[PDB]
Design a protein around this ligand. Structure first.
Ligand SMILES: NS(=O)(=O)n1ccc(-c2ccc(F)cc2)c1C(=O)O
Ligand SMILES: [Zn+2]
Ligand SMILES: [Zn+2]
Length: 231
């Protein structure tokens, strides 16, 4: 019943968590640079189809994700959006494409190709300036500006007031800015402020890693990033 945690998910299975009517998170774990981390994505019901937000961090995990979706939901995943270029977002795109899923990301998310990561097939125009938003099936995609990465997108589910922050939003227990290798710590608080202004009615906020909460995850993120930079 509780939100599943890193030591509760062996690397290779995937759990789903019901967030709201027609909205689930997916939780997987993966090893990176010798430590194991949980990671979140989103599933949003799209009539009799599903929209997937982010892979489950790797080919095997993403295959397991599709299997878990078939077991627990039983509707086909037809489209996926990756919210930035790192492997916890695009690793598994090749598995999705071979399972009939049309894969999408912004043109900026060029970064996957340059890094040697898997590359979504279709480009999402209309998201190149901070504050841009586009509709994509049952969600709104929002580019808040550089934060965790320069390309990071946010996803809002208006039917349920669910804000999926991806890696630009940290969980409340976070004490650090996470993997900052590709981050912009100077702009990150400004980007979070843009999210706060755009989605004041969000009821659930889902971080890229860790436990969902409410709107406080946004301010908390700004605080831990400012403190990391300052420190
Ligand atoms: N998206 S990513 O760069 O590949 N990634 C992988 C692991 C982590 C991570 C998260 C929390 C933490 F406390 C430590 C690490 C991240 C992240 O910061 O988004
Ligand atoms: Zn990342
Ligand atoms: Zn991440």
């Amino acid at each position: 019943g509780e939100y599943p945690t890193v030591n509760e998910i062996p690397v290779g299975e995937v759990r789903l968590y019901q967030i709201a009517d027609g909205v689930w998170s997916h939780i997987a774990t993966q090893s990176f640079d010798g430590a194991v981390y949980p990671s979140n994505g989103l599933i949003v019901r799209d009539g009799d189809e599903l929209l997937l937000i982010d892979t489950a961090w790797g080919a095997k995990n993403t295959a397991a994700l599709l299997a878990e979706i078939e077991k627990q939901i039983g509707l086909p995943v037809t489209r996926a959006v990756s919210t930035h270029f790192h492997d916890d977002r695009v690793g598994g795109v090749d598995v999705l494409r071979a399972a009939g899923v049309a894969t999408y990301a912004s043109p900026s998310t060029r970064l996957a190709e340059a890094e040697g990561n898997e590359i979504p097939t279709h480009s999402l125009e209309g998201l190149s300036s901070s504050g841009d938003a586009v509709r994509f099936g049952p969600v709104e995609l929002f580019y808040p500006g550089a934060a965790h990465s320069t390309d990071n997108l946010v996803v809002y589910v208006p039917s349920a007031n669910v804000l999926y922050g991806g890696c630009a939003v940290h969980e409340l227990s976070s004490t650090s800015a996470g993997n900052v290798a590709d981050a912009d710590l100077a702009e990150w608080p400004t980007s979070v402020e843009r999210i706060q202004k755009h989605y004041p009615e969000a009821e659930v906020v889902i971080p890229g890693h860790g436990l969902p909460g409410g709107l406080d995850l946004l301010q908390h993120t700004a605080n831990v990033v400012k403190a990391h930079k300052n420190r």
